[PDB]
């Protein structure tokens, strides 16, 4: 039941000792189930979707942008950069940097996307351009992940992010070729096996982007193609009161199991 | 558990073959291809937004190629971290690795990446060290005071720090 989804999400949140935000859009009938859907949450790494999408949008006018070589220098390495470090003292294209940011959460890759866009404001300006008035990216990697309670920097709401992810992956925020590029990248994510994907039927195709940060913040945003019905968009955000809390990918998998019962 | 570990990372040596890497790492932990090219990438415990890991690069795609590159994230912990901002500020480009370690503390650092572009010749070796204050290293989340120091041919070419005090 619908009531079971709300009761079980609240019970999951309580037993985890954190704050849980969920938004599920069913595009078959334009319905959306919410839990704390209008509360702000730190996005952490899920903001890489908007950075990659903003570069995709730029490439609709600068048609060769994704093939531009970008120098990877040791000074560009931050804390976690498993693909960029393979190419240090060489180049990666913006397409490769987008894929690395999305599929491995590479932080050097993210920072190159941000720099291409003129800073974090370039990502946020793209959000405004497609009608998202809630999203805000304010910092680069790694400090965008500080996840301080009450700090609006680098936050959005589940409702806002589910709507925007829907427009990017299923709607018309991007050109058709750019939408295909983004979806291809998301379907190739390597970081999400224990998060939303672990709570859904295995026959459903998933493209997702995880996030992780301080305050045990553990996030995932997904576009989902079930067999036999219209696609879904699912956002699961989770954050905790102690700065050094452990991540809880299992809470996102549980949230996915719970909310799927309302379909 | 048997996933990728720092012990395994230390056991794998420059010069080893692909099958040696897989045997030591545990083949189920490892992958090649895709964004890793002909490198072998082996995963450990969950950490940050993605697992602790090692990546091993090889001299070629040939089945008999040798390890010429080792990179790791959150597999190795510093043995006795004592880095401070004051110590970091005494480091200068042009210092040898030995000079850097004498400044930041012999047990403050771990090897982030190490690459021999002319293997087995050591000419042009690049080295990235991560160095940590006493409570800066974490095997699962963000560092609490860390630095990146990068070398070519054993000579410091650059440095950056985050949150040192």
Domain boundaries, chain A: 2-263
Coil, strand or helix at B109: strand
* Segment B60-68 long-range contacts (CB within 8 Å, at least 24 positions apart): B63/B17, B63/B18, B64/B17, B65/B17, B65/B18, B65/B38, B66/B14, B66/B15, B66/B16, B66/B17, B66/B119, B66/B120, B67/B12, B67/B13, B67/B14, B67/B15, B67/B16, B67/B17, B67/B21, B68/B14, B68/B115, B68/B116, B68/B117, B68/B119
Nearest to B113 among A80, A85, A210 (CB): A85
Contact A24, A256 (CB under 8 A): no
What's B3's DSSP letter? S
Topology (CATH level 3) of domain B85-162: Beta-lactamase Inhibitory Protein; Chain:B, domain 1 (3.30.1450)
How are strands ordered across the β-sheet holding A19-26?
A: A31-35, A19-26, A232-239, A217-225, A205-213
Contact A127, A102 (CB under 8 A): no
Residue B150 in contact with partner chain A when CB distance is under 8 A: yes
Q: Tokens 């030591």 belong to which residue?
A: B24
In this structure, the number of other CB atoms found within 10 A of the CB of residue B55 comes to: 21
Task: List CB contacts of B119: < 8 A, sequence separation 6 or more.
Answer: B14, B15, B59, B66, B68
**Smallest CA–CA separation between B50 and chain A, in Å?**
6
Alpha carbons B116 and B70: distance in angstroms, whole number: 9
Nearest to B49 among A45, A83, A214 (CB): A45
Contact B53, B44 (CB under 8 A): yes
Helix (H), strand (E), coil (C) string for chain A? CHHHHHHHHHHHHHHHCCEEEEEEEECCCCEEEEECCCCCEECHHHHHHHHHHHHHHHHHHCCCHHHCEEEECHHHCCCCCCCHHHHCCEEEEHHHHHHHHHHHCCHHHHHHHHHHCCCHHHHHHHHHHCCCCCCECCCCCCHHHCCCCCCCCCEECHHHHHHHHHHHHCCCCCCHHHHHHHHHHHHCCCCCCCCHHHHCCCCCEEEEEEEEECCCEEEEEEEEECCCCCCEEEEEEEECCCCCCCCCHHHHHHHHHHHHCCC
Q: Which residues of A touch B129 (CB under 8 A)?
A: none
Alpha carbons A158 and A34: distance in angstroms, whole number: 8
Nearest to A211 among B49, B57, B71 (CB): B49
φ, ψ for residue A42, nearest 5 deg: -70, 130
CATH tag, B6-73:
3.30.1450.10
What are the DSSP calls for B123-159, one per residue?
TT-EEEEEEE-TTT--SSS--SSEEEEEEETTEEEEE
Contact A33, A262 (CB under 8 A): yes
Alpha carbons B102 and B109: distance in angstroms, whole number: 11
Query: Which resolution, in Å, applies to this structure?
Result: 1.6
| Ramachandran quadrant class, A94 (left: phi over 0; alpha: psi -120 to 50; beta: rest) | alpha
Burial class from Cβ neighbours inside 10 Å (0-12, 13-18, 19+) for residue B33 reads exposed
What is the signed CA dihedral for A124, A86, A246, A206, rounded to 10 degrees?
60
A&B contacts, CB < 8 Å:
78
Alpha carbons A232 and A235: distance in angstroms, whole number: 10
Which chain B residue shows the shortest CA-CA distance from A96? B35
For chain B, the domains span 6-73, 85-162
φ, ψ for residue B93, nearest 5 deg: -55, 140
Coil, strand or helix at B8: helix
Task: List CB contacts of B22: < 8 A, sequence separation 6 or more.
Answer: B30, B40
Q: Which residues of A touch B158 (CB under 8 A)?
A: 74-75
Q: Active site residue: A3, A15, A45, A247, which one?
A: A45
Alpha carbons B59 and A61: distance in angstroms, whole number: 40
φ, ψ for residue A119, nearest 5 deg: 115, 175
Chain A interface residues (partner B, CB cutoff 8 A): 44-45, 74-75, 77, 79-80, 82-83, 85-86, 88-89, 96, 99-100, 103-105, 142, 145, 190-191, 194, 210-214, 244, 246-247, 249
Topology (CATH level 3) of domain A2-263: Beta-lactamase (3.40.710)
φ, ψ for residue A8, nearest 5 deg: -75, -35
Radius of gyration of chain B measured on its C-alpha atoms: 16
Residue A142: cis peptide before it, omega within 30 degrees of 0:
yes
Residue B55 in contact with partner chain A when CB distance is under 8 A: yes
Burial class from Cβ neighbours inside 10 Å (0-12, 13-18, 19+) for residue B128 reads buried
**Smallest CA–CA separation between B102 and chain A, in Å?**
22
φ, ψ for residue A15, nearest 5 deg: -70, -25
A45 labelled catalytic: yes
Alpha carbons B26 and B42: distance in angstroms, whole number: 8
Nearest to B49 among A85, A99, A210 (CB): A210
**Smallest CA–CA separation between A119 and chain B, in Å?**
19
Q: Residue A179's Cα: distance from chain center in Å?
A: 15
Q: Tokens 């994907």 belong to which residue?
A: A197
Task: List CB contacts of A191: < 8 A, sequence separation 6 or more.
Answer: A103, A104, A105, A209, A210, B49, B50
Alpha carbons A261 and A99: distance in angstroms, whole number: 32
Residue B120 in contact with partner chain A when CB distance is under 8 A: no
Which chain B residue shows the shortest CA-CA distance from A145? B142
The technique is X-ray
In this structure, the number of other CB atoms found within 10 A of the CB of residue A202 comes to: 7
Q: Tokens 């945003």 belong to which residue?
A: A221
Give residue numbers after which chain B breaks (C–N above 2.5 Å): none
User: Strands A205-213 and B126-132, how do they pair?
Assistant: unpaired
Packing angle, helices A94-104 and A176-187, rounded to 10: 40
User: Which pair of structure tokens corresponds to residue B86?
Assistant: 């004051």
Q: Which residues of A touch B93 (CB under 8 A)?
A: none
State the sign of the Cα–Cα–Cα–Cα dihedral A224, A225, A227, A230.
Answer: positive
User: Which pair of structure tokens corresponds to residue B13?
Assistant: 């040596």
Which of A43, A45, A96, A212 is the best residue to mutate to test the B interface, defined by the most B CB atoms within 10 Å of its own CB? A212
Which chain B residue shows the shortest CA-CA distance from A209? B49
Task: List CB contacts of B20: < 8 A, sequence separation 6 or more.
Answer: B12
How are strands ordered across the β-sheet holding B155-162?
A: B30-32, B40-43, B53-58, B67-73, B109-115, B126-132, B146-152, B155-162
> What's the Cα-to-Cα distance from B63 to each of B12, B17, B20, rounded to whole Å?
17, 8, 11
Contact B155, B96 (CB under 8 A): yes
What's B96's DSSP letter? B
Which chain A residue shows the shortest CA-CA distance from B56? A86
* Closest among A118, A119, A145, A149 to A19, alpha carbons compared: A149
Radius of gyration of chain A measured on its C-alpha atoms: 17
- CB half-sphere exposure, A225, CA atoms < 13 A: 8
What are the DSSP calls for B36-53, one per residue?
GTT-EEEE-S--TTS--E
Instruction: Report the DSSP beta bridge partners of residue A239.
Output: A19
In this structure, the number of other CB atoms found within 10 A of the CB of residue A91 comes to: 12
Residue B121 in contact with partner chain A when CB distance is under 8 A: no
Which chain B residue shows the shortest CA-CA distance from A245? B141
Contact B34, B73 (CB under 8 A): no
User: How many residues appear in chain A?
Assistant: 263
């Amino acid at each position: 039941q619908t009531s079971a989804v709300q009761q079980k999400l609240a019970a999951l949140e309580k037993s985890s000792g954190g704050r849980l935000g969920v938004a599920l859009i069913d595009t078959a009938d334009n319905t959306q189930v919410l839990y704390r859907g209008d509360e702000r949450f730190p996005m952490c790494s899920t903001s890489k979707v908007m950075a990659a999408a903003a570069v995709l949008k730029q490439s609709e006018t600068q048609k060769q942008l994704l093939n531009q070589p970008v120098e990877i220098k040791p000074a560009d390495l931050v804390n976690y950069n498993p693909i960029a470090e393979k190419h240090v003292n060489g180049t990666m294209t913006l397409a490769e940097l987008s894929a690395a940011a999305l599929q491995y959460s590479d932080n050097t890759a993210m920072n190159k996307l941000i720099a291409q866009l003129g800073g974090p404001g370039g990502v946020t300006a793209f959000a405004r351009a497609i009608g998202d008035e809630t999203f805000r990216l304010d910092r680069t990697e790694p400090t965008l992940n500080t996840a301080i309670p009450g700090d609006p920097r680098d936050t959005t709401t589940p409702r806002a992010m589910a709507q925007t992810l829907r427009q990017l992956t299923l709607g018309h925020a991007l050109g058709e070729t750019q939408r295909a590029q983004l979806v291809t990248w998301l379907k190739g994510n390597t970081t999400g096996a224990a998060s939303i994907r672990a709570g859904l039927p295995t026959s459903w195709t998933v493209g997702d982007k995880t996030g992780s940060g301080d305050y045990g913040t553990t996030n995932d945003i997904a576009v989902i193609w079930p067999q036999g019905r219209a696609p879904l968009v699912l956002v699961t955000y989770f954050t905790q009161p102690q700065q050094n809390a452990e991540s809880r990918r299992d809470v996102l998998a549980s949230a996915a199991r719970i909310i799927a019962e309302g379909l | 558990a048997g996933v990728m570990t720092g012990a395994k990372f230390t056991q794998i040596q420059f010069g080893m073959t692909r099958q040696q890497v897989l045997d030591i790492a545990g083949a189920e932990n490892c992958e090649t291809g895709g964004s890793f090219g002909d490198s072998i990438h082996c995963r450990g415990h969950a950490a940050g937004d993605y697992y602790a890991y090692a990546t091993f690069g090889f001299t070629s795609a040939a089945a008999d190629a040798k390890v010429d590159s080792k990179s790791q994230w959150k597999l190795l912990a510093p043995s006795a971290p004592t880095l401070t901002l004051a110590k970091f500020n005494q480091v200068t480009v042009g210092m040898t690795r030995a000079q850097v370690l004498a400044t930041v503390g012999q047990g403050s650092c771990t090897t982030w990446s190490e690459y021999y572009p002319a293997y087995p010749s050591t000419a042009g070796v690049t080295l990235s060290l991560s160095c940590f204050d006493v409570d800066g290293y974490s095997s699962t989340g963000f560092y609490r005071g860390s630095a990146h120091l990068w070398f070519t041919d054993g000579v410091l070419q650059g440095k950056r720090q985050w949150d040192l005090v």
